Coordinates of C-alpha atoms in Angstrom, one line a residue:
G13 CA 74.5 259.0 64.3
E14 CA 72.5 262.2 64.4
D15 CA 69.0 261.0 64.2
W16 CA 66.8 263.7 64.0
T17 CA 63.0 263.9 63.9
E18 CA 60.4 265.1 61.6
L19 CA 60.0 268.9 62.0
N20 CA 56.3 269.6 62.4
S21 CA 53.6 272.1 63.4
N22 CA 53.7 270.5 67.0
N23 CA 57.2 269.8 68.2
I24 CA 58.4 273.4 67.2
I25 CA 55.9 275.2 69.4
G26 CA 57.3 277.1 72.6
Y27 CA 60.1 279.7 73.0
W28 CA 63.8 279.1 71.9
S29 CA 67.4 280.5 73.7
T30 CA 71.1 280.6 73.5
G31 CA 72.0 282.1 76.6
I32 CA 71.6 285.5 78.3
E33 CA 74.9 287.4 77.6
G34 CA 76.7 289.7 75.0
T35 CA 74.4 289.5 71.9
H36 CA 71.8 286.7 72.2
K37 CA 68.7 285.9 70.3
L38 CA 65.4 284.9 71.3
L39 CA 62.4 282.9 69.4
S40 CA 58.7 282.0 69.8
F41 CA 56.5 279.9 67.9
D42 CA 52.7 279.3 68.6
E43 CA 50.5 276.4 67.0
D44 CA 47.6 278.6 66.2
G45 CA 49.0 282.0 66.2
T46 CA 52.4 283.5 65.0
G47 CA 56.0 283.2 65.7
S48 CA 58.2 286.1 67.2
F49 CA 62.0 286.7 66.8
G50 CA 64.0 289.0 69.2
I51 CA 67.5 290.4 69.2
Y52 CA 69.3 291.6 72.2
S53 CA 72.6 293.1 73.6
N54 CA 74.1 291.9 77.0
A55 CA 70.7 293.0 79.0
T56 CA 68.9 295.2 76.2
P57 CA 66.4 294.3 73.8
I58 CA 67.3 295.7 70.2
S59 CA 65.1 294.2 67.8
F60 CA 61.4 292.6 67.5
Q61 CA 59.8 291.1 64.4
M62 CA 56.8 288.7 64.2
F63 CA 55.9 286.3 61.3
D64 CA 53.3 283.7 60.4
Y65 CA 54.6 280.2 59.4
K66 CA 53.6 276.8 58.2
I67 CA 55.3 273.5 58.3
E68 CA 54.3 272.4 54.6
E69 CA 57.9 270.8 53.7
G70 CA 59.7 269.5 57.1
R71 CA 60.9 273.3 57.1
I72 CA 59.6 276.5 58.3
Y73 CA 57.6 278.4 55.5
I74 CA 57.9 282.2 56.0
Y75 CA 55.5 284.2 54.1
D76 CA 54.3 287.3 56.2
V77 CA 56.7 289.3 58.3
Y78 CA 56.4 292.8 59.9
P79 CA 57.0 295.5 60.1
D80 CA 59.3 295.5 57.1
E81 CA 57.6 292.4 55.1
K82 CA 59.8 290.1 53.2
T83 CA 59.7 287.6 50.2
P84 CA 58.3 284.3 51.3
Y85 CA 61.1 281.3 51.7
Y86 CA 61.5 278.0 53.6
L87 CA 64.0 277.5 56.1
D88 CA 66.3 274.2 56.4
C89 CA 66.2 272.9 60.2
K90 CA 65.7 269.9 62.4
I91 CA 64.4 269.1 65.7
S92 CA 64.2 266.1 68.4
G93 CA 62.7 267.9 71.4
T94 CA 64.7 270.2 73.1
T95 CA 67.2 271.4 70.6
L96 CA 66.5 273.6 67.9
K97 CA 68.9 273.3 64.7
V98 CA 68.3 275.8 62.0
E99 CA 70.6 275.6 59.1
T100 CA 69.9 278.6 57.4
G101 CA 68.1 282.3 57.9
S102 CA 68.5 284.9 60.5
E103 CA 67.9 282.4 63.3
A104 CA 70.7 279.8 61.9
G105 CA 72.5 278.4 65.0
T106 CA 71.4 276.2 67.8
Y107 CA 68.9 277.0 70.4
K108 CA 67.3 275.2 73.4
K109 CA 63.5 275.0 74.2
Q110 CA 62.3 277.5 76.8
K111 CA 59.1 276.2 78.3

């Protein structure tokens, strides 16, 4: 049916977008650095944050965020190549890979 892969430290790597309008959201994850999460409105950047992460459960583990650092938690998500499906969190929805 929906036959997803193991989320791992290598398939997540790169940027992830919805589309370019209204109120969009943008993500990145590096292999040996950090992630980054942005939020826009129409054609202006309105948020930014970064966080370290690990993949120690077939989920994102979040445990360092800035500038307002937050509690550590895990994030249920799926991946197969070019479609991120996050189920929970700020970034919960769908995105396409953007590299």
